[PDB]
């Protein structure tokens, strides 16, 4: 319902609220299915590379999948 109502948001805050809602939906997916969570994580990272929680969660999921074989990514994020 929040995503449906996002169409009525003022354009100034529309980008920020869309990013927030997509992050929340990606969290719900990560609870349900990690693949869609990672997809939305990539979508938001392309949309806003400056956000940290998205990158943290994406790298954390990658480390879970790669058994901590992305130490370079963690160092770069640090």
């Amino acid at each position: 319902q929040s995503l449906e109502a996002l169409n009525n948001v003022s354009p100034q805050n529309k980008e920020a609220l869309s990013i927030t809602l997509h992050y929340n939906k990606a969290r719900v997916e990560e609870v349900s299915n990690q693949s869609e969570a990672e997809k939305l994580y990539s979508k938001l990272m392309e949309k806003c590379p400056g956000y940290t929680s998205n990158k943290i969660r994406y790298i954390y999921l990658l480390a879970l999948k790669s058994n901590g074989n992305n130490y370079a990514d963690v160092q770069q994020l640090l």
């Binding site: 980008e15 920020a16 806003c48 400056g50 956000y51």
Partner: peptide, 6 residues
């Protein structure tokens, strides 16, 4: 520096 991030 991004007003969007702020």
């Amino acid at each position: 520096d991004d007003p969007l991030l702020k």
